[PDB]
Amino acid sequence: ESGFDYEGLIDSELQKKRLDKSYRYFNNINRLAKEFPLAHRQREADKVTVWCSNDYLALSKHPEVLDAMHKTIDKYGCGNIPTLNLEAELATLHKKEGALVFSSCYVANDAVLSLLGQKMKDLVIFSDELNHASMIVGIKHANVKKHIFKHNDLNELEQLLQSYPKSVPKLIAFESVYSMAGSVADIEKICDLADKYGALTFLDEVHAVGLYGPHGAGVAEHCDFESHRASGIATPKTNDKGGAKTVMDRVDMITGTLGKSFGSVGGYVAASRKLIDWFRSFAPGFIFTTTLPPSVMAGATAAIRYQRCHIDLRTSQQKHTMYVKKAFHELGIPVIPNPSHIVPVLIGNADLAKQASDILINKHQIYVQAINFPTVARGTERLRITPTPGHTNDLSDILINAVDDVFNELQLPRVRDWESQGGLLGVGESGFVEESNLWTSSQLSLTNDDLNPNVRDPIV
Amino acid sequence: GFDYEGLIDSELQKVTVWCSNDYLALSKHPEVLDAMHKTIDKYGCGAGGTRNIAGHNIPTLNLEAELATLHKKEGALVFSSCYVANDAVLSLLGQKMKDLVIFSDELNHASMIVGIKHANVKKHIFKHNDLNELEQLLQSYPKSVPKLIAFESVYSMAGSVADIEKICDLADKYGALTFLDEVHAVGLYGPHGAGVAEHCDFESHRASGIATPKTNDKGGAKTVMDRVDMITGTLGKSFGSVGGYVAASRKLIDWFRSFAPGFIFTTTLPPSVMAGATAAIRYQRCHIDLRTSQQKHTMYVKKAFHELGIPVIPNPSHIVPVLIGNADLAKQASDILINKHQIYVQAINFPTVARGTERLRITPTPGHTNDLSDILINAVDDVFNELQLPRVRDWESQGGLLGVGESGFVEESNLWTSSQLSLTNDDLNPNVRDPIVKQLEVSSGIKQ
């Protein structure tokens, strides 16, 4: 007899990814700690400027992080105190009673969501349609009834919550900042809905932490910006609206990554002591026994300590992003509007977006990855640009001219052109209301001395 | 509304390290530390992206190439950790083949159990290392039904070893894929540390060195390690780093690379962490004295415990489980060892092992010299007297347990023979020393 043809199945599936052009080719990119934001390709001599990297504050190369790794390597080796220090800093950042570190936030999401579903079998999960793959996977592994609500539609969310008695356990799983379009959730309104319908909230701040709030604790902290800034590390007595509890205090579970802004690898959840011990006790034991090396944790800890007391990292990134956005607006470069740090440039065609990404790196030595289906809906294909404190106006100008040339060379649609067909995603749409940038001019003018002195080198 | 806090409350209500995960003591080795220091200075700390965005680089390409070279496989893929690797591969197998039938050894560790659950396919658990029942389970299906046999090379709690060749024979006959977890093997077995699969043809691999041998140890066409369809391992134990990987055909690697969300959607491991692992893999490949050292240190302890009647569960591997038989006494022996004797050994209890089998797990390394073993040996002997713990003769009077004091029990012979323990680094093929390992295309994607 003959066995199942395994290689045939694998071949047919990989061939489909070749047909639809979703088969992926990784670019060799070696980021230079000394030359940030430069990187070199397989040949060290060929250098490019990285505009798509997710290291938002450039802390991957920062002296206090590199020194933390070097000194921690000498003492601990490569592969305890370092875990408690890191977990204590993360709990401090979010002003939560505790935090739990995992190998990655992908794991953190999968583990927490899975555990909530296993322990409450009646649980009903309400999930934003744009939630990250890790959260989709965790919700699946939770093996409970779920409802996907249209992106950031709070109207639809409420009617889904209404269909249940309040006594039914519920979880609302969403993100603060969604990276592909740079949209932002309304966290206070979701907290209000949670209180009304008796639901826990699960918030993924991965693209927020370090970039938002006075100390970079994320959008939940930005929600009461003045209350947190005044109180510093301490919990404020009242919120920005005068109430008893802050939004960040009202969210039950906050997950983040160490791999993005914090210039490291890892993931965590911050929540109340009861929740942390619950996860710590009943989650699969092997995600705790196998974890990050101490040198990696020390680096992330240093980055968190540094970024909490330096707001200039956030005001620097925001200013550089605005610079790029304003320039593109004057040139008719179709940026998808959003009140965040992300600069998605709308293309609208998958083939053209690839060609634009290729021309940018080969002709102009600019690295920007193109975004197409499945990651985005067909026809919405875009170039995702992510400014950092390290992209100074001089580098931005080069990017701006290079993008403008690519648009001319490929005759790609401008803002003017998208309007002619009615507009897309707020680009060229008559009477479209754009949300104001989360960072207000008042907040962008703040400096590090405006932060409470208790955030600088506190004992933790 | 619903009471969450009530439910949570209801459920809730200098030393010498002998239990460590770093088997070759390479985590602090100079060549690993030097690779990290140098990679840090050049690359910084984190990768700054995923493999698709900004997170694909030279240290990744070198690591995956070195792993594929170690296992003599067309390709290898690195994951955040070992449990991510197992969960990714197993999940995708069950996702893409929904009819697949998984045959799992009863002692597979939680990571494999979780991965098989996430595969969401029919499964059969066969008694540990029972290949008669496995063959009976495989024969009850036509050959055409896709099957996966999932097992480990070394089971870490009792130190027993699977027969990999025989399972491959069963997989060829009944038309099944094999998924082998070498996490507790790689670096410790085979001439070059490629694991038990390499040890299965020890002399063919030692002769050929880096190269694929033309025949196996029996004269046949394919080595055991070549016949295994998927080999998973960790960078977190013998290689003194963090991470996980699978080694397989380039088509399988491209499949995981393309379809596995746990590979795609997470940040790439720091470049320095990868350089560190690569340095360890290269050093350990061409130093067999690390493996002979660990085996001799493990055997030294076992012999001394034997002459003292300390009840070690017999195994042909690097592990020294010490049978206690009671959970509270095992914890109490561990507490005494660390507080009184400054010896750290963690007690292993239920669920990990069956109640009444509770034990102390000891993992010697090349860094445990006989002088350190002597301190361990004397401390355990004292603790056994202080707590009145049963000795071998005592287990012998009760009929024996797990091969301790069992009448007419023949112990499995060590995987490392006397001939193999006599080898030195000069007995390895020179081509494993300072080899030039070319990067792999499948790591970046294949062009057609």
UniProtKB/Swiss-Prot annotation, chain B:
The modification N6-(pyridoxal phosphate)lysine is found at residue 237. It is found in: Mitochondrion matrix. Substrate binds at residues 104, 123, 352. The keyword Mitochondrion applies. Pyridoxal 5'-phosphate binds at residues 156, 184, 234, 266-267. GO terms for biological process: heme biosynthetic process; positive regulation of organelle assembly; protoporphyrinogen IX biosynthetic process. GO terms for molecular function: 5-aminolevulinate synthase activity; pyridoxal phosphate binding. The active site is at residue 237. Its cofactor is pyridoxal 5'-phosphate. Disruption phenotype: In combination with a disruption of MCX1, abrogates mitochondrial respiration. InterPro entries: 4pyrrol_synth_NH2levulA_synth, Aminotrans_II_pyridoxalP_BS, Aminotransferase_I/II_large, AON_synthase_class-II, PyrdxlP-dep_Trfase, PyrdxlP-dep_Trfase_major, PyrdxlP-dep_Trfase_small. Its main location: mitochondrion. Optimum pH is 7.4. It holds the Pfam family Aminotran_1_2. Present with 22600 molecules/cell in log phase SD medium. Belongs to the class-II pyridoxal-phosphate-dependent aminotransferase family. This is 5-aminolevulinate synthase, mitochondrial. It comes from Saccharomyces cerevisiae (strain ATCC 204508 / S288c) (Baker's yeast). The gene is HEM1.
